[PDB]
From a paper:
In the human genome, 22 fibroblast growth factors (FGFs) have been identified as ligands of FGFRs, and are usually classified into seven subfamilies, according to their biochemical function sequence similarity and evolutionary relationships. Upon binding with fibroblast growth factors, FGFRs induce dimerization and autophosphorylation on tyrosine residues, resulting in the activation of kinases downstream signaling, including MEK-ERK, PI3K-Akt, and PLCγ. Numerous evidences highlight that the activation of FGF/FGFR signaling plays a critical role in tumor progression and growth. Moreover, aberrant signaling of FGF/FGFR has been frequently found in various cancers, making FGFR a hot therapeutic target in anticancer drug development.
Previously, we described a series of 1-sulfonylpyrazolo[4,3-b]pyridines as potent and selective hepatocyte growth factor receptor (c-Met) inhibitors. In the development of c-Met kinase inhibitors, we found that several 1-sulfonylpyrazolo[4,3-b]pyridines showed definite activity against FGFR1 at 10 μM, as shown in Table 1. Since the 1-sulfonylpyrazolo[4,3-b]pyridines as selective c-Met inhibitors have been reported, we are inquisitive about the binding mode of this chemotype as FGFR inhibitors. Interestingly, the co-crystal structure of compound 8 bound to the FGFR1 kinase domain revealed novel binding interactions, which has not been reported. The X-ray crystal structure of compound 8 with FGFR1 revealed that the pyrazolo[4,3-b]pyridine scaffold forms a hydrogen bond, with the backbone of residue Ala564 at the hinge part. The P-loop of FGFR1 lowered down to form a pi–pi stacking interaction between residue Phe489 and the imidazo[1,2-b]pyridazine ring. Based on the X-ray structure of compound 8 bound to FGFR1, the 1-methyl-1H-pyrazole of compound 8 extended to the inside of the ATP site of FGFR1, where there are a large number of polar residues and a corresponding cavity for optimization. Based off of the X-ray crystal structure of compound 8 bound with FGFR1, we found that it showed novel binding conformation, which significantly differed to c-Met ligand binding. Due to the novel binding interactions of compound 8, we thought it should be possible to selectively optimize the FGFR activity of this series of compounds. Compound 13 bound to FGFR1 with a very similar mode to how compound 8 bound, by using the nitrogen atom in the pyrazine ring to form an essential hydrogen bond with the FGFR1 hinge and using imidazole stacking with the residue Phe489.
Residue numbers in the entry: 464 to 501, 504 to 579, 592 to 762
């Protein structure tokens, strides 16, 4: 039913399927070992995405689109890269790079003081990598639409990788009240113009990066804790802006505030942010 693509196909018997990964939150995803991706007698830990049992024609369409998006966008150090696929004679498998330390929010929380604590340079370095991944995605004209620490994955070598940048999402079907599996409301990462007017741009992604920065320097803090949807609307209509996190230089809080500029055109680009974080890293102890 699915067209062959020898650029990416891997025979099913090269994939030893392992434990479920996301508890279901991010689609049907399992750890797996791939024999001879590159090198034919080496195994590589990878993550594999497939369709659930009760999956519609629309569900299959979506997974294909995401795979094809990964094909077009090309490779970068700081994004989750496509590695291969099994599309013939069985269920669609999309093989992607595996991030053994989980998402950036959990990785930060697991390293709060009362597992080793992260230095100031480590935290600014985390932000630089995430902005590098976003700079690359933007240069390829990709808009994430849901950039947050929960969608940054951390590899065994502490490499930050943006995840889920290729998902198919009908923005006019978002459940504003729907909560993450952690209990937070994704609307708290959306730029006002995206939330109120359904207008998604590279500039709204930069707003979301500002919130992500706030997550880094609170070591996994929760934005607007206790604030339900309707009151978030009020706070944004009134121009509310989160407070400076403790142990956060005034410079890095100005970056946050600059990302949260009321006027989208006045926010910095990811290209700008990368240049600035690069400089700030070189100057952090
Ligand atoms: C399609 N795709 C799947 C992975 C992938 C790679 N390595 C791991 C390790 N754990 N998990 S995870 O439990 O499912 C999880 C925890 N937080 C998140 C946020 C976003 C996503 Cl996609 N998954 N996730 C992984 C998922 C990359 N691309």
């Amino acid at each position: 039913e699915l067209p062959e693509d020898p650029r990416w196909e891997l025979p099913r018997d090269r994939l030893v399927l392992g434990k479920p990964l996301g508890e279901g939150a991010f689609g049907q995803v399992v750890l797996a070992e791939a024999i001879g991706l590159d090198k034919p007698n080496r195994v590589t830990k990878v993550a594999v995405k497939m369709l659930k049992s009760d999956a519609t024609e629309k569900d299959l369409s979506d997974l294909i689109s995401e795979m094809e998006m990964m094909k077009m966008i090309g490779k970068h150090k700081n994004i989750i890269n496509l590695l291969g696929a099994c599309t013939q004679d069985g269920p669609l498998y999309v093989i992607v790079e595996y991030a053994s330390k989980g998402n950036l929010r959990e990785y930060l929380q697991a390293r709060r003081p009362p597992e080793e604590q992260l230095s100031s340079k480590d935290l600014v370095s985390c932000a630089y990598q995430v902005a590098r991944g976003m700079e690359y995605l933007a240069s390829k004209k990709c808009i994430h639409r849901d950039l947050a620490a929960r969608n940054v994955l951390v590899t065994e070598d502490n490499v930050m990788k943006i995840a889920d940048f290729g998902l198919a999402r009908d923005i006019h079907h978002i459940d504003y009240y729907k909560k993450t599996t952690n209990g937070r409301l994704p609307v708290k990462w959306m730029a006002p113009e995206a939330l109120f007017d359904r207008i998604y741009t590279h500039q709204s992604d930069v707003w979301s990066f500002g919130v992500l920065l706030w997550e880094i320097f609170t070591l996994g803090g929760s934005p607007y804790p206790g604030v339900p949807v309707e009151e978030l609307f009020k706070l944004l209509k009134e121009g509310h802006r989160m407070d400076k996190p403790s142990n956060c230089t005034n410079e890095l809080y100005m970056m946050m505030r600059d990302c949260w500029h009321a006027v989208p055109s006045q926010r910095p680009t990811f290209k700008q942010l990368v240049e600035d974080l690069d400089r700030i890293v070189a100057l952090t102890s």
